[PDB]
């Protein structure tokens, strides 16, 4: 019959658009626009057709032939009840068929054991009960209450029980304020008495400068039917979405260490607010990384706490441009399960389906938990002033605990005395103040401490013969591989440096430093835009065959039993990428983790990660991060965005030994700088002003002797054979400007002015600067020289450090570019005239 | 008839997935994976069925019944040739039927007039010819050549010709490096000789410190069959996608000024690279704004220069997580037209469809121009070292101009002599150096210069009876409107302030300042998270009815003929939002344009806009931007992210009078500060350290007399009746710390130490500070006091300004928080101890 074809189009119409008419809002507040396609009359089916049997076809109901009365009911139960599945936009036929099997076979309605139902009720009770307790015990205090979205707690425990049920070993969570204290107490097993002690202010005992209670992270073991599973909740700042990239980098470092090439042992989970996930662009930057080979973690389960309001903003036309906040997920074709949070069984049922999807297909999946915010944005705020109707409806809306208990009683699946005792047993458990999570376990088996002082001794030396054999292996590539003539010219030059015929350039000394690290079995993860070859054609860590596209990585082939070596050409992001590498370095300190800006000027698109994480995470959260940032830097006439890494900004952020700001000027210096970062037992961030023109400067060279038997020099004394008595002025400087100073002093045959580099600006190396200055007893004045404008660079932030170094009688003077609004002139002509001007002011 | 249902599923398979098998790559380089659904056998159609006639259904070919062999030919011609249409993900049925009509009715192959074909050939000729000329005249110089994507120039001229053809009046373009120099010369009408002089370095005659040649913008009139259309190409920095939000704010200010409610008179256009559009999150932030009220511009035409490489990265698994760089567009259900760039008629056909779609449905549309990059990422780079196979293929790939010329000749629509002469006539036109755009026209009639010095006089005073009458109208609301009792309590307090019963609070003086600005007919646009009510429950510019949802905006109801007033609750973005307000303010200087951070700590997620636009756009591009940034600031024990607007960073960025950094401490000061921003003839950015606790501080109050008859004070002298001779120490300070200093000095019964506010830190008000210091001839030492840690705040950047101020005998000292990695402690208890310590260190002598 033609009607059998019409039944088939109706079935797909619900699969495409049934979620648009689904009962997803707990409050029932605003009606959904009608969709004609969901009505059989749109397909010319009438009541006479409704009594006739039909064939389901692809509808996976488990009965080949059905009356239309049950087919129409099955479609509404599957696609228009509590669950709104948005998945047909996906192009993979196997994945869409897979989701149809999960939903359509059960006809939407899920089945759980009565013990499973009693667990969801107790988990709702713990969520509501902890929040009503804090509002009584600490009225008015800022706790970002979960109330109205209490199903997030049973959804989360069901995720973790389901992770161990399918063999996952670790779960890493990154989230925001909403439900944060409920997570700490009711899933991660933080003791309630310790939460009560923080509200009273009696928590103490640290020189961590600290952070507010709803930014804290936690760790615990958590019993699951598959056994104990490690749990980790990240620290995060107030900035709303940026923790998500950091958690992605942590789990990748975990998956890399464990040899989990399919991310099936470590489950990442991120929790988002509905307004934050739509407005913040780092969400899309992270979705773009979800399958990038250098950042993929096997897929993330993403849960949105969609309380249909963001602070005081509730109009959909003010927050976003689409019907759902989750539509950003369609960029990577993620299935999206909207679910009513007043239907806990639907929440757990969609939660298992979402996890099963992520593990079957190793792809991101999103759970839209549609709910409400019972109170104001925080408990001191009045929501009626801006959402009067939403809170007149919430004020007469019963809690999800009460609602679910009413359903189990109607179905004779529970009795009211059991539901009542859970409310009171939980309140008594909070009064005792001990852990209230049944499933919590003490962690099973942390040293070595990596907070040691920057001037701690380290093994700078390396075997000179081992260093040359490493260099020879780097120059070797398969004979069949054919290099571009410029790359083989470069490896031919590296072959001469290994023979002693030519002093090493910057790239060889950098490559050698990586080689000694993997030679000792330590990991190297490099990341950046065009980091394999290098923006300035200097690295060439990856060699591409000129016949086929095949690559060969000499640093990955040094010897068997080497530490792993990876260098990824990153995606066009700096915010999410630098946050990813921050989470990688903190989770796995032992190796070298290095991010490379293509120019240091672009690093400011990750300014939140620099401000709220790198420079401040130790004082705030006791986190040590060894991440190294290569920021190309130097004034060469290329204009405002290709001159300044904003060195002045990193120096301004320096305090309390939080960071290292280094400006190497020699290939040997960058070699020792990189090894000290791994070799020295300190893991604090290394901000590097990477050279550009110095990669090929003829005077910027170092012998093999300088690497094997040298050390990193925080300050470098005068190098030419000046007589110390003859000096009348000492010029402090950093970076390439020294090389312009040196050649001009030699061209003048000037021996009355010494030049002293300060390779490490923070922490300031006091005695190394004084030691370089000591021989010049006749000195009368000192000069700070810099290519950079005076309102930028090291001048404003490092004046007191230089002044403390110099003898008391002498005064210090400035020589450099004038202060300016823009980092650099746009014209090359004006730049060279400025360069000659400042170089002459310093030497006269 | 069972095969008839199978034919319909085959037709929809191509509508859904034909683009996966389309020939989109000019190079033919990498084969695409088979989609099973596109071949009939998958649907049990065999050759015997191919001879039978079938019903096309909704297939819009213009014939209801067709043999299957010709339905299959029509489907491959429509969805598997040069055009790859991705639109079935959209949920609006009408928009899908609209696209099917355009595409299926021409059966893939579209028809153009012979003049239109000769125009696309000449426009391809100018695109190739200009770049080969620059490579000949200036070998090795960095010009980001369009070559391989030459189809872009005819596509752009067809976008503009079709805009005026349908009555649009302005077109505003924002783009990147790729094809930038070709855009200026061959679309915008920049003189080639001025471009050649910039390559030679002979450009001069400006105090703009300037920028590189491929960041410059341009303006022109452009003849179209419907008449002249204004053209505007934005200045942009090197940061790749950030210009896009700025262009959205520029056309929105244009649509607002023109009374264009639906943006049908001003067309926004954005051009993107394949790697940047996938990696940068500001792209998704702007897509989220496309239908937000208060940022919607009626839809943007977005063009991707998809040359399948970004610098040295060409592997898809390293650049993105999806098959197409454009898949982010699906977040807003934008249709996406992939098109092979070696088929200019396909490019022009899809370009007309994209504009017609954007004007019919006022929604974003994307044109994916699939092409190649003929040279390296720039002309000094070697691309073979990292993409050997792509450049062995490009090295033997003929240019789009030659390829199109071969097609017009093979079809006898053109002759080889006509195509040859275009190549040579164009090279001669470039040698002469005059404008080469035939459609270019001189602009028709920019004089109230707004770069005047910050100390320029302005009309600070306002009539006091009008100021009180403005306040009475602000307190009036409709009888049917019902306020929440806290809001009615607040307007009753404002009703008391208008009568003189009570001094004005911070919110009343701020609202009053807005009222005087709209009262004189000037525009006010405020934007920021929860900016309607205010994060701190102080503004309440929008009044929500407690019975229905209706709003009432008292500032929009001052009197008829007032300037428009708008206050928008922004999206949860700061980067794309602050870039949008930068483009609004720069395009429309005359009014007040204000962005409000929810806390000043959150502005650093828009740090690129602050660095590359706000702090540097005047020296780089001669752009005046009057935008005001409200950044809440102040140490109150709320922690590292709720204390510091990073004042030290803005002070570090101050040079060459680029910005204003102000810390008002009185309700009257913010009133005069806001009016000075519009009433004074200067349009430079205003960075404001907004108070938090001062909004309710009993001592932070001002009389109506201070607003009507006062003025903004860059520095505020001692307010208490101290005798100058008895003073022994002067304490400089700004912001709320003054009130902690003042209240402590009164509790101590101390008359030996004066306290002087410095409301404007940059540009530094020298003589006003010296004037405040003059009476204290007996002073022995000076102190800068600040809540901030010593490495933050004003200490490092303003030391020389204070030291040059003080009398020669005296020396300057510091009193404030110790330097720290974090902006603020996480514990309230600790906060107080530090506050009492620094306040006591300043007052003890
Ligand atoms: C990056 C960033 N910008 C601004 C803020 C200030 N802020 C904190 S919470 C909030 C609203 C959050 O709305 P939503 O995402 O829906 O989360 P909810 O609290 O409603 O659960 C805003 C704008 C922030 N914390 N982070
Ligand atoms: C925000 C930002 N990050 C980094 C850079 C440095 N950069 C300039 S061009 C480029 C590659 C651009 O690739 P694509 O988007 O495809 O544009 P194309 O030049 O190939 O057309 C990079 C990483 C930049 N200009 N802006
Ligand atoms: Ca961003
Ligand atoms: Mg919310
Ligand atoms: Mg590209």
From TrEMBL, chain A:
Protein residues bound to Mg(2+): 274, 307, 309
Gene Ontology biological process terms in this record: glycolytic process; tricarboxylic acid cycle
GO molecular function: metal ion binding; oxoglutarate dehydrogenase (succinyl-transferring) activity; thiamine pyrophosphate binding
Domain of life: Bacteria
All copies of domain Transketolase-like pyrimidine-binding, residue ranges: 504-697
Binding site residues for Ca(2+): 575
Enzyme Commission number(s) of this protein: 1.2.4.2
Secretion signal span: none
SMART domains, alphabetized: Transket_pyr (SM00861)
Positions annotated to bind thiamine diphosphate: 177-178, 238, 240, 275-276, 307, 377, 602
Cofactor: thiamine diphosphate
GO cellular component, one term: oxoglutarate dehydrogenase complex
Keyword field: Calcium, Glycolysis, Metal-binding, Oxidoreductase, Thiamine pyrophosphate
Catalytic activity: N(6)-[(R)-lipoyl]-L-lysyl-[protein] + 2-oxoglutarate + H(+) = N(6)-[(R)-S(8)-succinyldihydrolipoyl]-L-lysyl-[protein] + CO2
EC class (word): oxidoreductase
Similarity comment text for this entry: Belongs to the alpha-ketoglutarate dehydrogenase family.
Subunit-structure text: Homodimer. Part of the 2-oxoglutarate dehydrogenase (OGDH) complex composed of E1 (2-oxoglutarate dehydrogenase), E2 (dihydrolipoamide succinyltransferase) and E3 (dihydrolipoamide dehydrogenase); the complex contains multiple copies of the three enzymatic components (E1, E2 and E3).
Its job: E1 component of the 2-oxoglutarate dehydrogenase (OGDH) complex which catalyzes the decarboxylation of 2-oxoglutarate, the first step in the conversion of 2-oxoglutarate to succinyl-CoA and CO(2).
Name the record gives this protein: 2-oxoglutarate dehydrogenase E1 component
Organism: Vibrio vulnificus (strain CMCP6)
